[PDB]
Design a protein around this ligand. Structure first.
Ligand SMILES: Cc1cc(CN2C(=O)C(C3=NS(=O)(=O)c4c3ccc3c4CN(S(C)(=O)=O)CC3)=C(O)[C@@H]2C(C)(C)C)ccc1F
Length: 557
């Protein structure tokens, strides 16, 4: 029961790949230690192939089936609708990979007759054929990291026509079912503000709180055929149109369970029998399966008063402590159970008794003070990776502007405000690109966002205090300064100086640019303004935001 089998054909690139950090006239203003930053390339795909390839054994017990039964009960309450071809098309990102059958993403988005004709013929084939494996492409991802080198992650995805069909059959399901089945434990429903609030309240709810994150080693490759059939049975609990049921059976049999793996040059690379990382159901499937296995493992480990927070395979548990030594033993049994369920650990879970020492979705809780001196909890992270990616993005336009994603989700943090906002607004002013819409990915979905709308977006996800936090914690200040020394990033005093300039330059522009000056950089001046609610923030359609996760799912808003 191997996760993959291979032919020896290489996982090839589409385009030229750079691994070394590109340097331009802006690079040194952000980061001097250039040799510490690299991008992954297809050249490391062979090592990843080794890592993701292993035998899965699964031992399923009554705790597993009990939880599953409970999950299906909740799933039966869901009604989902089929999308029209045209609805599905409009959810397609403008730069999504083109079909093999003579059309591309902009063809799909424009409802070009050729595209829509192909999609109708794909749909009809799903309805008629529930057996034939569907072809997928396997590609190496190019992502940027700091040293101390990771091999490239793999992405496996079916043809554009199929992807539109997935949307038609399952978009409403994957959008609505996770929150119904998992309620408050479903992470992708929450803005950052809502997530910190859930974490802090959950911690406070316990008499003696203990918490841990569980890291599954290569979660996608631990997902078995059983797991994928169980996912399908959950989806099938929904109130669905007859064509939707047939299409979901067909996609499950022909695509989700497994299939052939073709490189960008058309050569067969092998065969997958685990989760495809690049399908509509990757996030929803991962979340449900992670939740099922973890909920049953909690019961196996007799952890008391378990509260879970699950975003795909990212799992945090907060529960009642039994003292340190017993907690350690309980975690060992939790892991044993997970392992029997085919989700063994990368790093062994560590129990934590301070909420701020728990990392989940790569973030920890920390504390600052708002304008009134009130303590405010917010989410932050070690800024090394964000800054290494910012440095790549200073010299190269990328399909995913991670800095924008980071300014949005980590707006309240010391490092996003002082460094990211300052640096990137300086660049945008110089190139007259304040108004130019840019793509970023939040909870796996693509969003086209104009930088001038940042203040309103930040207000809506975080509140006005995002523009007012001060008196950050010693350990957080210390982590940021340390990171800046490691990377050769100028110290925070330099950034304050530049922000004052950027702020002025922005106010000179007037209008929405001045509003950016006023809100984003009020921390940089000594005569602070009073920041009042933004009129445009009440008008923003932030629907689409924080309903669900869609990593690998080819979704655009
Ligand atoms: C303040 C704050 C900051 C973050 C950091 N972020 C993430 O972790 C993801 C994320 N996107 S995803 O859906 O691709 C995904 C994420 C996290 C874990 C996981 C996944 C997706 N999966 S999967 C492949 O199983 O769906 C693995 C687990 C994000 O979009 C943001 C980011 C913009 C800064 C990157 C998160 C919540 C939050 F409140």
């Amino acid at each position: 029961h191997m996760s993959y089998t291979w032919t020896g054909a290489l996982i090839t690139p589409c385009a030229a790949e750079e691994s070394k950090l590109p340097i331009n006239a802006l690079s040194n203003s952000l980061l001097r230690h250039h040799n510490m930053v690299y991008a992954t390339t297809s050249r490391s795909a062979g090592l990843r192939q080794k890592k993701v390839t292993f035998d899965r054994l699964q031992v399923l017990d009554d705790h597993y089936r009990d939880v599953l039964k409970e999950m299906k009960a909740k799933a039966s309450t869901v009604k989902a609708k089929l999308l029209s071809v045209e609805e599905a098309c409009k959810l397609t990102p403008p730069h999504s990979a083109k079909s093999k059958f003579g059309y591309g993403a902009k063809d799909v988005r424009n409802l070009s007759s050729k595209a829509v004709n192909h999609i109708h013929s794909v749909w009809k084939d799903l309805l008629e054929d529930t057996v034939t494996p569907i072809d997928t492409t396997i590609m190496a991802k190019n992502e940027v990291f700091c040293v101390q080198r990771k091999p490239a992650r793999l992405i496996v995805f079916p043809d554009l026509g199929v992807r539109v069909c997935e949307k038609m059959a399952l978009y409403d399901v994957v959008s609505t079912l996770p929150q119904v089945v998992m309620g408050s434990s479903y992470g992708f429903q929450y803005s950052p503000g809502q997530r910190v609030e859930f974490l802090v309240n959950t911690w406070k709810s316990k008499k003696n709180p203990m918490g841990f994150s569980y890291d599954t080693r290569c979660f996608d490759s631990t997902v078995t055929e059983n797991d994928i059939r169980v996912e399908e049975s959950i989806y099938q609990c929904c109130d669905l149109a007859p064509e939707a049921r047939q299409a979901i059976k067909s996609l499950t049999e022909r695509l989700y369970i497994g299939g052939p793996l073709t490189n960008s040059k058309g050569q067969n690379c092998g065969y997958r029998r685990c989760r495809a990382s690049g399908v509509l159901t990757t996030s929803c499937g991962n979340t449900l399966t992670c939740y099922l296995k973890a909920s049953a493992a909690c019961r196996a480990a007799k952890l008391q008063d378990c509260t879970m927070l699950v975003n795909g395979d990212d799992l945090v548990v907060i529960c009642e402590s039994a003292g340190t030594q017993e907690d350690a033993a309980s975690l060992r049994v939790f892991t044993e159970a997970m392992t029997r369920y085919s989700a063994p650990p990368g790093d062994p879970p560590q129990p934590e008794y301070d909420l701020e020492l728990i990392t989940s979705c790569s973030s920890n809780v920390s504390v600052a003070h708002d304008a009134s001196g009130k303590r405010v909890y917010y989410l932050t992270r070690d800024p090394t990776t964000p800054l290494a990616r910012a440095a790549w993005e200073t010299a190269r336009h990328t399909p995913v502007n991670s800095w924008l994603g980071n300014i949005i989700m980590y707006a309240p943090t010391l490092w996003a405000r002082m460094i990211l906002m300052t640096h990137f607004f300086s660049i945008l002013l110089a190139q007259e690109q304040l108004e130019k819409a840019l793509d970023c990915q939040i909870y796996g979905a693509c969003y086209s966002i104009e930088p001038l709308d940042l203040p309103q977006i930040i207000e809506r996800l975080h509140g006005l205090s995002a523009f007012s936090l001060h008196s950050y914690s010693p350990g957080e200040i210390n982590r940021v300064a340390s990171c800046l020394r490691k990377l050769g990033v100028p110290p925070l005093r330099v950034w304050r100086h530049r922000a004052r300039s950027v702020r002025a330059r922005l106010l000179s522009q007037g209008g929405r640019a001045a509003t950016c000056g006023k809100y984003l950089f009020n921390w940089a001046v000594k005569t602070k303004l009073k920041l009042t609610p933004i009129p445009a923030a009440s008008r923003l359609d932030l629907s689409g935001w924080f309903v669900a996760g869609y990593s690998g799912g080819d979704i655009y808003h």
